[PDB]
Amino acid sequence: KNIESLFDYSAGQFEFIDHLLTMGVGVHFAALIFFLVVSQFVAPKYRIATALSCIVMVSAGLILNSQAVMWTDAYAYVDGSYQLQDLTFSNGYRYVNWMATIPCLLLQLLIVLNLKGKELFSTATWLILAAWGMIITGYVGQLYEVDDIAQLMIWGAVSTAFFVVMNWIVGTKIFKNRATMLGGTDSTITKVFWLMMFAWTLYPIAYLVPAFMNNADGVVLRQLLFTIADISSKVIYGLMITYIAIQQSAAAGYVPAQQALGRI
Ligand SMILES: *C/C=C(C)/C=C/C=C(C)/C=C/C1=C(C)CCCC1(C)C
Numbered sequence: 001k002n003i004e005s006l007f008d009y010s011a012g013q014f015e016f017i018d019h020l021l022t023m024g025v026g027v028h029f030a031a032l033i034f035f036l037v038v039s040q041f042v043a044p045k046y047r048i049a050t051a052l053s054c055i056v057m058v059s060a061g062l063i064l065n066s067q068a069v070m071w072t073d074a075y076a077y078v079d080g081s082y083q084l085q086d087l088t089f090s091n092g093y094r095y096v097n098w099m100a101t102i103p104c105l106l107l108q109l110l111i112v113l114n115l116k117g118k119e120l121f122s123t124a125t126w127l128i129l130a131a132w133g134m135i136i137t138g139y140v141g142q143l144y145e146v147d148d149i150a151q152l153m154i155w156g157a158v159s160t161a162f163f164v165v166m167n168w169i170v171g172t173k174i175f176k177n178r179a180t181m182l183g184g185t186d187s188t189i190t191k192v193f194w195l196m197m198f199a200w201t202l203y204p205i206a207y208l209v210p211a212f213m214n215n216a217d218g219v220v221l222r223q224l225l226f227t228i229a230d231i232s233s234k235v236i237y238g239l240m241i242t243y244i245a246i247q248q249s250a251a252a253g254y255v256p257a258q259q260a261l262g263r264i
């Protein structure tokens, strides 16, 4: 069903993928420790945004770990190359994980935007439906990446419509609420929008790899793109959300935030 299953891999290709996925685990778990220790400097109003970064680190780090183990289970070194054994490797589990991690990424943004009550709950609801629509339709599409490329493209067009609408809700909420933001974070949150547009677009590029690069090297490329994108969309994004949360905390008078920032 997935293109990974069609090829044998050289030692270099096989090991590089293994290292990519392992480094990703280490990066997410290292970040998790940082987000954990820094959360005591966040005011109550934003503390959940930093907690959600911890939740995303574990979720993504578990999926990467699980992908790495599945990669080594599925392939063994036989007659000069890594060849498929009885177990199967696939990217489908990443899509299932997005069902949880994308809502979390969107909720931390809504929190640092100072949204609350009814606006918060309704914005989050529409965002979560649009995200699930994107992820489900892309999940279905990738089932056809070996059997029916045309079907992969069409499901990907549907998925892209949900993506574009989700980004429009995000941009609309960022550009409208920029002005409520304290401590100069009105400037930083704009960079957050651009980081998301960039980093999230890596995923659909990766989804199209079976169409424009259907071979072992394309398999490597796809893993590399997911790694750059996971890091950018989860770790780098989380660092910027945390910075915005602490800065707004300090500007609103939360003393542990002022002292943390004071001592660096
Ligand atoms: C941390 C994981 C993140 C931020 C994953 C984001 C995933 C997407 C933006 C997926 C987008 C897709 C399309 C827009 C079309 C092709 C199918 C998808 C689901 C890869």
Ligand SMILES: [Br-]
Residues within 6 Å of the ligand: 043, 044, 045, 046
């Ligand atoms: Br507060």
Ligand SMILES: [Br-]
Residues within 6 Å of the ligand: 059, 060, 063, 094, 097, 098, 101
């Ligand atoms: Br994830």
